[PDB]
Amino acid sequence: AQNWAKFTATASLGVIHKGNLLEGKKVMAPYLPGSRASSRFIKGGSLYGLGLIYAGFGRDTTDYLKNIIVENSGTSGDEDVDVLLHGASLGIGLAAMGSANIEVYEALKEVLYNDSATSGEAAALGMGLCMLGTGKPEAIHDMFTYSQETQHGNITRGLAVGLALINYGRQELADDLITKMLASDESLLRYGGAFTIALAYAGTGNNSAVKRLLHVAVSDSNDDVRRAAVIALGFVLLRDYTTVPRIVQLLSKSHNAHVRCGTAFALGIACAGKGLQSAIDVLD
Amino acid sequence: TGRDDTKETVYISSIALLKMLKHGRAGVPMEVMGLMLGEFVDDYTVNVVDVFAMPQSGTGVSVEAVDDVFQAKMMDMLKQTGRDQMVVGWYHSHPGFGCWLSSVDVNTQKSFEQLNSRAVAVVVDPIQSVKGKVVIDAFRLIDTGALINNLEPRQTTSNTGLLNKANIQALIHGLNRHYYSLNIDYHKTAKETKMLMNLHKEQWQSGLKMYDYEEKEESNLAATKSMVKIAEQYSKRIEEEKELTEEELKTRYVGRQDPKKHLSETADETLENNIVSVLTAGVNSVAIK
Amino acid sequence: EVKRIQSVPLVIGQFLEPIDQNTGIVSSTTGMSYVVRILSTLDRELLKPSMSVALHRHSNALVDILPPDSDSSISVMGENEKPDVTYADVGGLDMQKQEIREAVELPLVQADLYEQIGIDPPRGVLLYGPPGTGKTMLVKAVANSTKAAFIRVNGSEFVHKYLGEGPRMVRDVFRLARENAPSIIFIDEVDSIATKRFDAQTGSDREVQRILIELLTQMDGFDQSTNVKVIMATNRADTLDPALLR
Amino acid sequence: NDKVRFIKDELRLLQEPGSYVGEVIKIVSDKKVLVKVQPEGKYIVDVAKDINVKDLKASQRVCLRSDSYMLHKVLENKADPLVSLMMVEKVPDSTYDMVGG
Amino acid sequence: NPLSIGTLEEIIDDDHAIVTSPTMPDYYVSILSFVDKELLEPGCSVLL
Amino acid sequence: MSLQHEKVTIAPLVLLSALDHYERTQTKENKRCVGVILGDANSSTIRVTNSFALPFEEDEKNSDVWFLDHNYIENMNEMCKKINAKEKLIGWYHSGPKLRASDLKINELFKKYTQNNPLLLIVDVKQQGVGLPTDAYVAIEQVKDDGTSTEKTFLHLPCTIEAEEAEEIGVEHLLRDVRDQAAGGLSIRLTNQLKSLKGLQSKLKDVVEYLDKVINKELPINHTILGKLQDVFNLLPNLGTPDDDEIDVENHDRINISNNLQKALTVKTNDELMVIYISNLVRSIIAFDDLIENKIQNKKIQEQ
Amino acid sequence: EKIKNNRQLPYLVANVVEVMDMNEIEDKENSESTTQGGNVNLDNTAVGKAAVVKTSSRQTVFLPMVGLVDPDKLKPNDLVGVNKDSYLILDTLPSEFDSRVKAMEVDEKPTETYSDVGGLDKQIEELVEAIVLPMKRADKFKDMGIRAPKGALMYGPPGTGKTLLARACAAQTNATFLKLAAPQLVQMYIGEGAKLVRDAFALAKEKAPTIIFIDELDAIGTKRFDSEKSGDREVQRTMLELLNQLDGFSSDDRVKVLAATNR
Amino acid sequence: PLQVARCTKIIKGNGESDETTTDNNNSGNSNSNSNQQSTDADEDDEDAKYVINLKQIAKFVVGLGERVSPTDIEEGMRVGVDRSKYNIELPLPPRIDPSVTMMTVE
Amino acid sequence: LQSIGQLIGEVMKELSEEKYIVKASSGPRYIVGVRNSVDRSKLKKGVRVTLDITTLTIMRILPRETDPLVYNMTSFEQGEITFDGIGGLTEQIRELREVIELPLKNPEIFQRVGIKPPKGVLLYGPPGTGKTLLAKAVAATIGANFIFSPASGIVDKYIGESARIIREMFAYAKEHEPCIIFMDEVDAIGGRRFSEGTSADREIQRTLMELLTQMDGFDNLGQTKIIMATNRPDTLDPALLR
């Protein structure tokens, strides 16, 4: 393996070495930069991997990773710099998940303005992991507008869903944002639009949320947009999964592929907890 | 590592897409070509803003037909109007043949590939645009050394992507031993959309506007007359519909195409049309006087 | 989507035969046989019988039906003019003219009477003899008086100047006759199709030989219809094959 | 839904590269078969894994899709040129009930 | 694939031959690889 | 010159070209972009196939000073011949949003290029108008009959589109709207029916207020414009004439065809009602048989 | 530089069916005798003057004739080059023939003089009257005002040195010496054998005066053209074609036929 | 491969009227395309040219390769021309009329 | 250069006012569209049209198109010799004129008489008697449209192509009426029926049959006059003698 295939190997190690927090630093040591330098995928994939070990527990670790991001963000660098910078940014997201620190918000912001191709994606996601559920209005407003400024597609994708993550659990207070994201003519803003409804109204079978997601799924010709709406249903109807197979029978009837891809995923999420015999039968 | 490339998808703007078509239809059967003016950003977006057409040769498309002398002159003209940026490749037009690069087109491309490594070759088919879908595809040379190390998989990872086809045959052969094809998305802003949509001065001059009542008398007369004939086949037909197997009945007593469905369609089309014909008729009489 | 594919540009094939009902075999007018998809919302009951057909340009799919009236060799004269001559401008051969009003005129109008006696219908009509004899004059005459569609070829209107042109003409005239029956097919001279011997050791024979063989096949089908069977004329008396006279 | 989404699968089919009507003159047992595409040339060419070269026999009319020139399915309806020959010959239908004495 | 069958007019013994296909074009071929000069004799049907 | 002028057929590539060249000069805040218009003319319908930028400056403080580079245009035309040598200069695009009277002075310069009276095309870049967002004008010199001297003036030419066959499949290709300003189904045509009536309301309102201006604000009388408005009255329909009674009788005729057809569709559906009802009668047998059968299956699956 | 790209090899070959003609009115429509309908155009149906060509790919193409080739150099039956991948006429070419025809052409046959044809003095003087002297003393055909003889037959018993005299004394005087054979004229392809008589006389007329020495004369020296069930209708067909190209038809006086025969 | 052709007529490339570009007859003798312009009064177009007929039955005008000269190439002689763009590469033994003749040698 | 070549067909059969069937000159019959920049009433059968190669839509109507073989035949009209120059056979000139030159000049007096205007002359005699000279003498003096066609030079190598030549030759003489078509040395394609020999004998028959129906049948002629020059008329099919 080489390229991103080699990237995959190094960040898979930190799915395996999840937990055993004391020995997480140790096992990741010779793949961390300063003892690895053979390939830029290994050096970054240890940062992605290291975050995974410390996910949900990573308050100390957040400080340690933060030096590397500030270092390489006075530059936009070369593309070698990007692969390294990319795995630092996903890593601090995971470490600081649910923390609500402003330090991490601000740090990744300097990455986002570099406009790095792959690190911009990982920063955009990272803001959303750190600041899950807070509802800071400054965070919402800057991301949305920046989405139109950026010309790299990955960065838009990353921004769009990360807004959803920040407006988690906030229900009807997130309602104003939902309307701007849907009103757009940019597919990415709609792709992320679906997910904002999914996470804010998550686990409460609010009828208004399911209606938007349904209408949008059908009514847009754009492929990402369709797909995303379908996957969103599972999040909403997490509590009342009794109703999910009868609602989504419809989407699996239709022979558009992106629809059908998302229909499966919606059954995956919804009946994840405990199998429902019907769910399996529709997926066959 | 060396330097490691991944997928790209070529974003052909609305202005460029029509321009390529215009040039390709006009010079056919002769192969027509031209340079792509654009800008390259990201690692996944090749933005082709505009094209222009290079003078054609009877010696087709080749290494010596491009003309770099006329390019340098063309470049300055774009320079003074702010419409220069940086050249991102070339296009040419084959006629009745698929999207694929000929042996001569490999050698043309190889010279572009040295100058900019992110050079694309875009094949337009204009004799195959007679369908409701315009078949267009893009290619980009993968280096001879690369194929030995089998680095075509390297380009496929990091998304599922469309992995769309619209042509094979010659294309897939050439793919194995040279190039990697790129999928096509088209860019357009929310201004460009409205221009595209509007193709009528009959937006407000098409509901009060109407066809003479002679022509409506013809539609009424044809429609009523024919539905008798569909109705006589349906009568022969439904003397059955009580034997064994639907599929048999359809062959033997001519259930084919469904005469039941065919009568519904013919009735629905004229029924909806006359509501409009009256609806516009009365609207004019009452509002205008 | 599918309506733009239905419309033009289209090359004309001919439906040779079925092998499925959503897949057929056509020979196009490029001089190639193609296996093609067959689009729905079209005929299935004049489609499958040999008849002219539209196929799309480069895709090679049967996307439209083309009436058995169109792409014909010539059109009926039961809805145009007939040659305006009468059998009162025929002077002599009243003796030969008795047998031919017997062939044409009497089963066209009085088909019931032949079944009533139990006598077979009349069949094809041969006019043969040296060219002084007035053969044509009577055919022109009887076509006006009998009040039926009149059709028409000559065997150098079955000219093959493209490959597989010539057998397509045979299928055109006969299918058309059946459709607007009662009808009469005239083949003006057949000294090129009616050649006693053949070579078939070169390409130029075999196209004509195929015309002759197809000609025989459709006259055998033609029987027991209220059409009058082919009027035809020859020069010599030994143009005729023992196959075209049987 | 049944009417609109059948059509979209049907667009692929109509947009075929073309396909030809050949007949196998004789088999080669390396899973290649000598197939004379009938208005065109002779070609020795591999088959699909839907058919075997012992289901194909000389005088098998087959379909073969020119993108590799590879045989798909056999023609389920063959017609012999021997039918065309028998027609010329002609047998009048008669038993011993049309003679007597 | 496929194997374009032509009919061999004649070889010149130097590692080339003139063939005339049934599909009609004539081609100046090479006798080269898994084929010999003794296996090729007029009127034979050769595999291109 | 040529006096043959009728319509301006405009290709979609022309429309898009002037929006693009405006946005890549990034001219805004009422700063303009004037380029060349290319195409066929010496012809009654003026046929604009393509257009390209020309370097152009417009001064906004004083509007009576502008930059046009005469050298560029000739060079540029030569390179147009490379592309397609059926193109010559037949006019110029303006970037809108409207007609200006400083356009009269620009116009002089392009008479030493053309073989026709030069074309003025407003490509509105903000895409405003209830139909097409282009007005089209041509410069005429004429005596004025309201007792004043010979003016040079821009008289309106209608705008329509025709395009290449090739271009036409591309326009549709980018687009994915279902349209509501073009006609399709019944419901679509009701939406267009209403749009047309409100269109009429808008233009007609403007006529009443135009009349108001002449005699209270004092726009100059122009006999040529008001003269068509008189003809609106003479060609106007009337009520209770034997023409407007034919108009009712024709409605009664068409309504009867609609009645038979609604009823034909009802035949078809009552047959489809009986058919599915037979399907249910059939499926009843299967249902009965299934229950006795499922008895045997339950015990076996529990055994394993 | 554009023109030179197109001019460069290769290019396709067509003949000129006819020159159709179209008005130079591009300021509305063409109306030579065919009025144009619908829409008015500069140059999509209101084009300039026209050339119809027949290609060798088996088609015919209707183009506006090229503005660089004049309408005087286009006349029906000219052979002109045409662009290989379009179809515009670049240039004019001299009419090509078959390779059977190019065989007929001179190889510069050497003289062997009449003195090395021993004996037979009177016959040589008669044969010289026939071929040599209407060319030379063409001063005398213009004075006297007689017509030229269109050929001299040399017959007799075989082996009397017919062939040798002809070869020798034709090469002696200076004129085009064509090499044509009677048994050649009958070929296995129908009506190609006739065509080959027309190409031989064509070659004589470009290079006129020419003497066409026909070796043998008894292949086409067939006393039959009343036949019965044979391929002999092809044989006698090229005898009749010989008579049509010895039929007056202008610039044929200059061009003679020598012919040797044994029967 | 090479597309097998066969030459049908040597039309020598000077005196073919393969310059029409210069429309001037005031310059040159104008008996040939190299005598269309008298400044050089010499080569402005290839010295020798050829008309071939392919065995797909399509005639094209082809010229001189870089390894053949007109000593090598003659009328009636088979040639091989490059398959994609036609231009004489290599001369071949006389005619395609030969076939039974190759039997007769024993 | 920039005005590319378009392929020519002719209309076989109007199917509709938007859809026309053409037979091209590449071979294929198409259903083609119409561009609405030309007529739709001058598209009738037999009408020469050019159509596009890159959407196969009719661009425009064209006058008729006539073969270079029949253009060769017309460009032969030379021989400036007068009817004076026929010595001895001046009687034969009065006789020749009855059939050909009096209905040619004025067919109106032959209507009063009440017979069909006649056409056709056979010149037969033992050779060297100036049957060709007679053709060149009447070509000189009247000065009409003439077709001097060798009748064995209208056949060629290809098949069905000898029907195309002569069909359009009658097309030419109908247009440029009054026209006389000189068939000179008509004995090869004037031959007996045959057809128990080679395929050549069947080529004469297919061309001969095209000539018969085109002259008299359900197409007649009416101001075209035939002069047939044959050497012997015992070489001839009785159909053509008739």
Ligand SMILES: Nc1ncnc2c1ncn2[C@@H]1O[C@H](COP(=O)(O)OP(=O)(O)OP(=O)(O)O)[C@@H](O)[C@H]1O
């Ligand atoms: N019975 C008749 N009464 C009147 N005219 C006649 C009669 N018989 C023959 N004719 C005339 O003789 C001429 C030639 O005869 P016709 O046209 O019928 O030829 P045919 O015998 O079919 O020759 P072929 O063998 O070429 O077919 C015509 O003008 C025709 O009107």
Ligand SMILES: Nc1ncnc2c1ncn2[C@@H]1O[C@H](COP(=O)(O)OP(=O)(O)OP(=O)(O)O)[C@@H](O)[C@H]1O
């Ligand atoms: N009179 C002669 N003087 C010299 N040599 C002669 C003479 N007669 C015959 N020959 C020789 O015999 C050869 C054969 O005669 P040639 O071919 O010239 O003439 P011919 O009468 O047409 O006979 P054929 O056609 O039967 O060969 C001559 O080429 C020459 O070598």
Ligand SMILES: Nc1ncnc2c1ncn2[C@@H]1O[C@H](COP(=O)(O)OP(=O)(O)OP(=O)(O)O)[C@@H](O)[C@H]1O
């Ligand atoms: N009646 C005449 N008056 C004067 N000169 C004549 C006369 N008859 C013939 N000639 C001369 O004879 C020449 C040859 O006659 P021509 O070839 O035309 O004859 P034909 O009888 O058609 O024979 P064939 O077609 O078999 O050659 C004329 O060019 C002329 O010089």
Ligand SMILES: [Mg+2]
């Ligand atoms: Mg007859």
Ligand SMILES: [Mg+2]
């Ligand atoms: Mg001799």
Ligand SMILES: [Mg+2]
């Ligand atoms: Mg004569």
